[PDB]
Enzyme design. Structure first.
Site, short mmCIF file in Angstrom:
data_model
loop_
_atom_site.label_atom_id
_atom_site.label_comp_id
_atom_site.label_asym_id
_atom_site.label_seq_id
_atom_site.Cartn_x
_atom_site.Cartn_y
_atom_site.Cartn_z
N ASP A 45 -2.56 10.96 6.77
CA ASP A 45 -3.77 11.78 6.83
C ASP A 45 -3.67 12.97 7.82
O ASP A 45 -4.54 13.19 8.67
CB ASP A 45 -5.02 10.90 7.09
CG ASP A 45 -6.34 11.64 6.94
OD1 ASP A 45 -6.54 12.28 5.88
OD2 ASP A 45 -7.16 11.59 7.89
N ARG B 199 -4.90 3.44 -8.52
CA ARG B 199 -6.02 3.39 -9.48
C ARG B 199 -7.07 4.49 -9.29
O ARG B 199 -8.24 4.28 -9.61
CB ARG B 199 -6.68 1.99 -9.48
CG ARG B 199 -5.77 0.85 -9.98
CD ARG B 199 -6.39 -0.52 -9.74
NE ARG B 199 -6.65 -0.77 -8.31
CZ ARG B 199 -7.26 -1.85 -7.83
NH1 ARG B 199 -7.68 -2.80 -8.66
NH2 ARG B 199 -7.45 -1.99 -6.53
N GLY B 200 -6.64 5.64 -8.80
CA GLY B 200 -7.53 6.77 -8.60
C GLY B 200 -8.22 6.83 -7.24
O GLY B 200 -8.89 7.83 -6.96
N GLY C 276 -7.13 9.89 -5.36
CA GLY C 276 -7.24 11.10 -6.17
C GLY C 276 -6.08 11.29 -7.12
O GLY C 276 -5.53 10.31 -7.64
N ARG D 283 -7.27 2.73 7.89
CA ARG D 283 -7.33 3.28 6.52
C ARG D 283 -6.38 4.49 6.36
O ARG D 283 -5.94 4.78 5.25
CB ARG D 283 -8.78 3.70 6.13
CG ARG D 283 -9.32 4.90 6.95
CD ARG D 283 -10.75 5.33 6.61
NE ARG D 283 -11.27 6.27 7.62
CZ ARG D 283 -11.91 5.93 8.74
NH1 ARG D 283 -12.15 4.65 9.02
NH2 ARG D 283 -12.32 6.86 9.59
N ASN D 284 -6.09 5.20 7.47
CA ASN D 284 -5.28 6.42 7.49
C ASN D 284 -3.82 6.19 7.88
O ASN D 284 -3.10 7.15 8.11
CB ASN D 284 -5.96 7.51 8.36
CG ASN D 284 -7.26 7.98 7.70
OD1 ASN D 284 -7.36 8.10 6.47
ND2 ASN D 284 -8.29 8.23 8.49
N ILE E 158 -1.11 6.58 -8.88
CA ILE E 158 -0.91 5.58 -7.83
C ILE E 158 -2.30 5.22 -7.28
O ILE E 158 -3.14 6.10 -7.08
CB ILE E 158 0.04 6.14 -6.73
CG1 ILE E 158 1.50 6.16 -7.24
CG2 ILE E 158 -0.06 5.32 -5.46
CD1 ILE E 158 2.42 7.04 -6.49
N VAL F 285 -2.80 11.55 -7.52
CA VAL F 285 -1.50 11.16 -6.97
C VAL F 285 -0.80 10.30 -8.01
O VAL F 285 -1.37 9.31 -8.49
CB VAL F 285 -1.56 10.47 -5.58
CG1 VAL F 285 -0.17 10.37 -4.96
CG2 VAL F 285 -2.50 11.22 -4.64
N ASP G 166 -8.54 11.85 13.12
CA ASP G 166 -9.06 10.80 12.23
C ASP G 166 -8.15 9.58 12.14
O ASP G 166 -7.86 9.08 11.06
CB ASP G 166 -9.42 11.35 10.82
CG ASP G 166 -10.40 10.47 10.01
OD1 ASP G 166 -10.76 9.36 10.49
OD2 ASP G 166 -10.78 10.88 8.91
C1 LIG Z 1 -2.28 12.26 -0.23
C2 LIG Z 1 -1.74 11.84 0.97
C3 LIG Z 1 -1.35 10.52 1.13
C4 LIG Z 1 -1.49 9.60 0.09
C5 LIG Z 1 -1.06 8.17 0.28
C6 LIG Z 1 0.30 7.77 -0.24
C7 LIG Z 1 1.48 8.43 -0.09
N1 LIG Z 1 2.50 7.73 -0.70
C8 LIG Z 1 1.97 6.61 -1.26
N2 LIG Z 1 2.65 5.68 -1.94
C9 LIG Z 1 1.91 4.66 -2.39
C10 LIG Z 1 0.54 4.52 -2.20
C11 LIG Z 1 -0.20 3.35 -2.72
C12 LIG Z 1 -1.56 3.20 -3.04
N3 LIG Z 1 -1.84 1.98 -3.47
N4 LIG Z 1 -0.64 1.33 -3.42
C13 LIG Z 1 -0.46 -0.06 -3.82
C14 LIG Z 1 -1.06 -1.08 -2.86
C15 LIG Z 1 -0.61 -2.48 -3.23
N5 LIG Z 1 -0.94 -2.78 -4.64
C16 LIG Z 1 -0.31 -1.82 -5.57
C17 LIG Z 1 -0.76 -0.40 -5.27
C18 LIG Z 1 0.35 2.12 -2.98
C19 LIG Z 1 -0.14 5.51 -1.48
C20 LIG Z 1 0.60 6.58 -1.00
C21 LIG Z 1 -2.03 10.04 -1.10
C22 LIG Z 1 -2.43 11.36 -1.26
#
Ligand SMILES: c1ccc(Cc2c[nH]c3ncc(-c4cnn(C5CCNCC5)c4)cc23)cc1
Length: 279
Positions: free
Chosen positions: A165, A32-33, A36, A151-152, A30, A38, A147
């Site tokens: 976060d 694109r890295g 980390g 962004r969080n 999820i 995920v 924090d």
């Molecule tokens: C630890 C703690 C929190 C996270 C955050 C996270 C949790 N649940 C998520 N579900 C989806 C996404 C995510 C990231 N990018 N995107 C999209 C944005 C729009 N374009 C397509 C990609 C979705 C992030 C998280 C991660 C690790």
């Protein structure tokens, strides 16, 4: 895993997801890295309902001591759930896994900065109100975020903001390789954080929302922020930010922590501003 303390194993059973209840797509990351290790996943609840989830692999955990501490953070975080706080779905024991709800729109800052999206002033105040509600909940539990920033915070498919976060969801942006401008003045001076220092950060987050993700104090060095604030200089009123909402931001940045509003007062004041908009 047989070396785990049995009373701690019993204690964590309500947080543990059985390996037969979780399908991890280790071939599909999820974000694109950028977040980390995920991955997309599928969680099957007790009734067999399929839940789209985000699965973080905790590669930094090796020994049984770190494993036990991970089980405890899971136990504590499972007691935190609110519509405006990222809720832990569960944990799985390769490396230990943290299972989180899937957030369609990713982080709040990238969403408001995306030129293809057009959130109205109402929508932006609405996001700030949702953050204030999530923070009121965390503050009621005596939890200090430390924090808080756009962004969080995450945004789901229904445009519900989740303060993230914290707990097992902390170090969200941990990238593998081959926040002084949100901090209260006393935290910059003493390195001690309180709910009133989170109120300061909240005010900076409100300013990020009303400017659609502009960076705060872009011409000031992180070393020079303390002096800048001691001079009585503050982030300026964004172009389309209502005056009562800017008054609320200025109250968040009062140099005396005791003079700042509580998150309960912030939800009250912001909810009344929000209600003035058509929708
Ligand atoms: C630890 C703690 C929190 C996270 C955050 C996270 C949790 N649940 C998520 N579900 C989806 C996404 C995510 C990231 N990018 N995107 C999209 C944005 C729009 N374009 C397509 C990609 C979705 C992030 C998280 C991660 C690790």
């Amino acid at each position: 895993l047989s070396a785990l303390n049995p009373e701690l194993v019993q204690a964590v059973q309500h947080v543990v997801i059985g390996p037969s209840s979780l399908i991890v797509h280790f071939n599909e990351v999820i974000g694109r890295g950028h977040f980390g290790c995920v991955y997309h996943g599928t969680l099957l609840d007790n009734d067999g309902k399929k839940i789209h989830c985000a699965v973080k692999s905790l590669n930094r955990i090796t020994d049984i001591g770190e494993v036990s501490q991970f089980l405890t953070e899971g136990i504590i975080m499972k007691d935190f759930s609110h519509p405006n706080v990222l809720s832990l779905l569960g944990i799985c024991l390769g490396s230990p896994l943290v299972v989180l709800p899937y957030m369609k729109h990713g982080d709040l800052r990238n969403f408001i900065r995306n030129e293809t999206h057009n959130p109205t002033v109402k929508d932006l105040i609405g996001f700030g109100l949702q953050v204030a509600k999530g923070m009121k909940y965390l503050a009621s539990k005596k939890f200090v975020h430390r924090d808080l920033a756009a962004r969080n915070c995450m945004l789901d498919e229904k445009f519900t903001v989740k303060v993230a976060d914290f707990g097992l969801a902390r170090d969200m942006y941990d990238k593998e390789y081959y926040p002084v401008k949100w901090m209260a003045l006393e935290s910059l001076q003493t390195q001690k954080f309180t709910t009133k220092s989170d109120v300061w950060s909240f005010g900076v987050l409100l300013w990020e929302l009303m400017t659609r993700g502009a960076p705060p104090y872009p011409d000031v060095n992180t070393f020079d922020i303390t002096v800048y604030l001691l001079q009585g200089r503050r982030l300026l009123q964004p172009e389309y930010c209502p005056d009562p909402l800017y008054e609320v931001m200025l109250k968040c940045w009062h140099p005396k922590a005791e003079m700042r509003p509580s998150f309960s007062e912030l939800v009250s004041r912001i909810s009344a501003i929000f209600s003035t908009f058509i929708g």
